[PDB]
Write a protein that binds this ligand. Structure first.
Ligand SMILES: Nc1ncnc2c1ncn2[C@@H]1O[C@H](COP(=O)(O)OP(=O)(O)OP(=O)(O)O)[C@@H](O)[C@H]1O
Ligand SMILES: [Mg+2]
Ligand SMILES: [Mg+2]
Ligand SMILES: [Zn+2]
Length: 813
């Protein structure tokens, strides 16, 4: 079997012994030549889809060689072209021979996967054949949006009778003999996938005279079960519903010699299939940990057919930084809300290319490292002399920045990008360690994999690991080194998406793991080390991202502190928000009441969100929070606090501690959520995208409900779903009357759906009290009489209403 070796900084496949050189190769018999060609083909196919790699063939001949005539054409067919140099390069090291395989790139249409054979067949006039990836993709995309019968109806035939028509796109005749097996998969998929038709078994293929083997050959009662089992064993795939099995019919007709029963003949009719049917699983491969495993039929067909999803908040305001229609196979699409920074503006702002000097980065972090640590400057300025220009990106650990546990004893990591050299990964160990090399190797491994899986880098990239200290790689070919400004900028841009990318909340509404790009401010906040920032009172406007960074930080804490995901405790005020965050299972979750009630003896890290809506009515939460966090055996765990501090009174004794004691501090100063008019109006009250703001006054409750029903009708007439709307009121006790009123007024338009905020899973309009609802959001929000029934809830409730409406806000004061 193919074996994957872990000790390398990029994916390496060793195929065992191989003999190359056409003069040397052609001597070998096929039962070995083709076997080894197929092993190498498995390797190459696997790596062209799994984000690139290196193939490592061993040999027992030491002189230089050349690609064999068979392999240099199998690679061309597999890549679907003769431009081998673009994807494969040859370099050998004596008895070891390497070919370095880029990662496939669907973008300039070319398909999204590379596979030896698609296993799909179709009838072309008189011929049957397999399909190549381009034709397979065209066919799958297309299916994503009588003389024969008068013979079939005959119940018997005589030996030697000539059938009146030849073979065609509709029919075939097959001579008989073991032959009762394997004969069906050859032709049946060909007919089903297009046109449908018949195949006659027991009839000469050329003379067309019936022969029907003989009595001793066929037992119809067994042949029927055999043929049906063979038919229904062939894998199929559907995009439609319900899943119809293979539609077919059979006749096992007695056939006579001189009028005497002499044998049997079979006529099988195959009807056009509503979807694609595969003779066998496509011969395609993708490599997982330690194993290069085949792709299943459903996985294959799904992968080849994926495309960028569309919806109201996926279009006209979201910009496609990466697409499934131009990136590698395994890349998830990425987006960035219109009006924020792209991937381009972000790397300019974070990793701008110098013209003539090797800029370090991040400047502040370099300052902290050099001041903190003795001789780091001395150790590094030596090993930066050769490289001329580029960037050197530092961090206190590149493992935790890529979702791998930070290692004890690491001083920092650094990525070295420079012109006329490959990117290089530096880790500066505090002291030499036996296991130290493993950390740098695996970190290089994962950074490389992410740079082309998550990064979406169509280009040709390699990463190398170096272990420094304060106290035999693959000689990648010459073309993998950054040859100018353009390619350096491309690689930096596809590092921007490795770092600033996070799993969007639209993954719930779409199912696919759509990634999204942070802002500069949030990245600045997120980059802070944890072991030096045990406490932090983050600020920011409402709807600016506090929840995002909160969620991210329970992953970062889990990585850094080696703690199980259940020891990190979240806290909040509203049950709906805790519901929205409880299911992620990245943490244990609570609300402030039970937070005081419960005895958290197993908690070691706390992240308090929307803190400004807390209250002392049951006791003190801040004191207990410090008591828990600071009692940890392993040292004081995080106690990050989030909150809102627009220019409005917080009040309360524990409406955040005294403002002079809120330090250290950070500021997320942008309202990404809402649209322009909502942002414009929302700013006035606190004193890039279209939307609507509608305030109506002096309307009766009857008129108000008529208007909201009419607007729901209008929006659903434009694609908005039941889950795209919300109608909110002041208090919970006011919910009951208005629920009934709305369900009534909606009768005139015969709308039916209404459910609370707790029932968030169903596609129903959500109605609840704002204080209860706070923490969530919907595309359209209706406000029914927001009023200061209890000014203990921060008096500015018109903000907690207008902050929930992404694109359309309707206010009824
Ligand atoms: N980088 C980003 N680009 C675009 N939109 C983003 C980004 N980060 C977050 N958002 C969106 O902005 C909104 C704010 O979400 P989040 O819950 O984190 O904010 P918040 O200020 O904590 O909210 P709340 O106070 O209402 O609980 C969400 O719709 C979120 O999907
Ligand atoms: Mg024929
Ligand atoms: Mg929030
Ligand atoms: Zn179907």
């Amino acid at each position: 079997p193919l074996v994957v070796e872990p000790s390398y900084p990029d994916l390496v496949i060793n195929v065992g012994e191989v003999t190359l050189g056409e003069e040397n190769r052609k001597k070998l018999q096929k039962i070995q030549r083709d076997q080894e060609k197929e092993r190498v083909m498995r390797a190459a196919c696997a790596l062209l889809n799994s984000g690139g790699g290196v193939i490592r063939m061993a040999k027992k001949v030491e002189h230089p060689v050349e690609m064999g005539l068979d392999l240099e054409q199998s690679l061309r067919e597999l890549i679907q072209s003769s431009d081998l140099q673009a994807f494969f390069e040859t370099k050998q090291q004596g008895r070891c021979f390497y070919i370095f395989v880029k990662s496939w790139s669907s973008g300039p249409v070319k398909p999204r996967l590379c596979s030896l054979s698609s296993s799909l067949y179709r009838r072309s006039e008189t011929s049957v054949r397999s399909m190549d990836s381009r034709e397979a993709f065209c066919f799958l995309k297309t299916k994503r949006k009588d003389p024969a019968d008068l013979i079939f109806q005959k119940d018997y035939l005589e030996y030697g009778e000539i059938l009146p028509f030849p073979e065609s796109q509709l029919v075939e005749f097959k001579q008989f003999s073991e032959y009762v097996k394997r004969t069906i998969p050859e032709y049946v998929p060909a007919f089903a996938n297009t046109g449908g038709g018949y195949l006659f078994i027991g009839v000469d293929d050329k003379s067309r005279e019936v022969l029907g083997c003989a009595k001793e050959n066929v037992d119809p009662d067994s042949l029927r079960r055999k043929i049906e089992q063979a038919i229904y064993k062939l894998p199929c795939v559907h995009f439609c519903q319900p899943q119809r099995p293979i539609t077919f019919t059979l006749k096992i007709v007695n056939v006579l010699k001189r009028g005497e029963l002499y044998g049997y003949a079979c006529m099988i009719r195959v009807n056009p299939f509503c979807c694609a049917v595969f003779s066998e699983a496509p011969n395609s491969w993708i490599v997982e940990d330690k194993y290069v495993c085949s792709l299943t039929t459903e996985k294959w067909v799904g992968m080849m057919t994926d495309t960028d999803p569309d919806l109201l908040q996926l279009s006209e305001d979201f910009e496609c930084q990466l697409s499934l229609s131009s990136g590698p196979p395994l890349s998830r699409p990425v987006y960035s809300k219109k009006g924020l920074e792209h991937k381009k503006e972000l790397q300019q702002l974070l990793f701008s290319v110098p013209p003539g000097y090797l800029r370090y980065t991040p400047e502040s972090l370099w300052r902290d490292l050099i001041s903190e640590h003795r001789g780091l400057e001395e150790l590094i300025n030596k090993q930066m002399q050769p490289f001329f220009r580029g960037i050197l990106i530092f961090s206190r650990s590149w493992a935790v920045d890529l979702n791998l546990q930070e290692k004890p004893g690491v001083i920092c990591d650094a990525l070295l990008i420079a012109q006329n050299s490959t990117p290089i990964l530096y880790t500066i160990l505090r002291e030499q360690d036996a296991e130290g090399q493993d950390y740098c190797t695996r970190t290089a491994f994962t950074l490389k994999q992410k740079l082309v899986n998550m990064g979406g880098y169509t280009g040709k990239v390699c990463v190398r690991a170096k272990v420094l200290c304060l106290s035999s790689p693959m000689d990648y070919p010459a073309s993998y080194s950054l040859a100018g400004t353009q390619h350096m900028e491309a690689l930096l841009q596809s590092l921007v998406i490795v770092l600033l990318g996070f799993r969007s909340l639209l993954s719930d509404q779409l199912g696919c793991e759509v990634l999204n790009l942070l802002t500069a401010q949030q990245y600045e906040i997120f980059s802070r080390s944890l072991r030096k920032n045990r406490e932090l009172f983050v600020h920011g406007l409402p709807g600016s991202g506090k929840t995002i960074m909160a969620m991210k930080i329970m992953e970062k804490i889990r990585n850094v502190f080696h703690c199980e995901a259940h020891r990190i405790l979240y806290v909040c005020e509203n049950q709906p928000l805790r519901n929205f965050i409880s299911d992620r299972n990245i943490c244990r979750a609570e609300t402030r009441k039970t937070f005081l009630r419960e005895n958290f003896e197993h908690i070691q890290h706390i992240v308090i969100d929307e803190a400004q809506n807390f209250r002392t009515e049951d006791g003190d939460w801040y004191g207990k929070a410090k008591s828990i966090t600071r009692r940890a055996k392993g040292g004081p765990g995080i106690l990050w606090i989030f909150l809102d501090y627009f220019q409005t009174s917080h009040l309360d004794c524990s409406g955040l501690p005294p403002l002079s004691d809120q330090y250290p501090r950070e500021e997320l100063t942008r309202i990404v959520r809402n649209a322009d008019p909502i942002a414009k109006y929302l700013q006035k009250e606190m004193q890039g995208v279209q939307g609507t703001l509608r305030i109506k006054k002096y309307l009766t409750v009857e008129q108000i409900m008529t208007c909201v029903a009419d607007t729901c009708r209008r929006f659903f007439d434009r694609g908005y779903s039941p889950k795209d709307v919300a109608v909110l009121v002041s208090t919970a006790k006011e919910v009951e009357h208005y629920k009934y009123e709305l369900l009534k007024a909606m009768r005139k338009k015969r709308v039916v759906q209404l459910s609370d905020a707790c029932d968030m899973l169903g596609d129903h309009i959500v109605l609840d009290s704002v204080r209860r609802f706070s923490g969530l959001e919907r595309s359209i929000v209706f406000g029914i009489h927001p009023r200061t029934a209890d000014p203990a809830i921060l008096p500015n409730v018109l903000i907690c209403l207008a902050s929930r409406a992404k694109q359309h806000l309707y206010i009824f004061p």
